């Protein structure tokens, strides 16, 4: 009776959001990579669920939440281990090949990448802008895990993966890095083990020009989901650890000033029981494009009915 | 890609509509039947579809329109026989037992009767208000087709929400329903005919009909399209009907009212005469249909149209 995604609660509003998305991308003519002007600053938070009686709480969770990935990551102590920070919750995402974009898109705007705007922005970037430095950073991280001109063809293959051909090719770590530079906003992927886990910082941008709240994605079994906060004393933050999270595609200069880069690109605070954490953004989506308030109203209406 | 009901285009808005529905029912203290204060005046029209290329037009029709009933009624010359009046179109409706209410509800507001507000209003009426006159009118129409007290108590039990999740509803329930809506209903298809809200003076009623289609135990709304003209916005009150032009049945009249039948039609509907093909060839009557008057805050059609516009750009 409740729908299986936030956006289905007001498909007209979701269309409005998805129409605004491509007009907000700025394409420089001088080789600077294309990027969002405004909409990268938006962040979604789930509504509170604890005021509903446990049985009907369960009906909401089954509808919206990806309980498989939520359990895998909680059990392994990657997700919601720290009692002093807010609970994060995994929303369902389509496994059609474009889940990285569906996940990232949901995190910011509450809609998936159904019109392939994020996916095509990735591809367009990699085909039309200077990728010399991305290729370099990629080659350097690849060599760390291990003499020939076979490097050039893997790179051209990674560009072809970004396209919309065959329903779509999956996307690996370098695409996430490129994507955070399109969004001028860092991405943190929490996972098992699956080298995808870690922090992607928009290093082709000075920190002052970037949004200093991360996009938090969960990842398991080739599947990305957004890990959003709930609106309810605990601090709004994601732990960056005790062993540090991997910070991806650094050069060796940047790798030496790693902690300072984190401080520049995220807002780092120290948490009690000393380990660091990044501040998370508050829900700032205006009503005109806030799908969560619409879904909450379906829930409120269905709850009155549920009760006697 | 496109959803299978108008309401799925903005479920939040449909919830708003369905929350407003029960608060608009007024329950008199003096025995008058309970009735809608405002929302019975609303009428829904489909958006134009002919500007889309035929293949993509077909995707919209398959999504929204009940093509089985549309074809059955057109083929038999009951629906859209008259070239001078606007085309009517059958929207899909659930066959869960409460289709009369789903159909009527869709016609006015673009949502089905998922919360059983119309269904419960019917039942509540028949259990709690004086039904002496409804029973009389029923007995009289029943005898014309041929233990009375037990059939009547059975018809009240049919109106409830018990024990095909719900019991089906027959002609008397449609009559009682138009008196709750203070608005007449026309069913095109013995269920076929005109139900007038005769427990109300015409001055207190909405004089545009609700037009439903009916075939194989199934009710659907027959809504108009938003068009350019020149054709008149109206529904014919006669059949083409094999040989000869023949008036629609007007239901549950007493014999006084049955003698002033034409004047009752003029009181409760807005009757106009249409130019008849041939012109001694001469005018048969039709009832004016309402224009789309649902304000934006509760207009699901404008929302569905915007999904279509967006999906059409992509289609191309």
From Swiss-Prot, chain A:
Positions of the UniProt region annotated as Interaction with ubiquitin: 170-172
Variant or mutagenesis effect after changing residue 93 to A: Minor effect on 'Lys-48' deubiquitinase activity
Region forming the signal peptide: none
Localization of this protein: Cytoplasm
Effect of residue 223 to A: Loss of deubiquitinase activity
Mutation effect (residue 66 to A): Minor effect on 'Lys-48' deubiquitinase activity. Strongly reduced 'Lys-63' deubiquitinase activity
Domain OTU: residue ranges: 88-230
Active-site residue numbers: 96, 99, 223
Top-rank taxon: Eukaryota
Residue span of region TRAF-binding: 54-259
Name by which UniProt lists this protein: A20p50
Species name: Homo sapiens (Human)
Lineage, highest ranks first: Eukaryota, Metazoa, Chordata, Craniata, Vertebrata
Gene transcribed to yield this protein: TNFAIP3
Residues of the whole record sequence present: 5 to 358 of 790
Swiss-Prot record, chain B:
Region span, TRAF-binding: 54-262
Active site: 96, 99, 218
Coiled coil stretches, renumbered: none
Location(s), subcellular: Cytoplasm
Residue ranges of domain OTU in the record: 88-225
Result for mutant: residue 99 to A: Loss of deubiquitinase activity
Chain spans, region Interaction with ubiquitin: 168-170
Protein name: A20p50
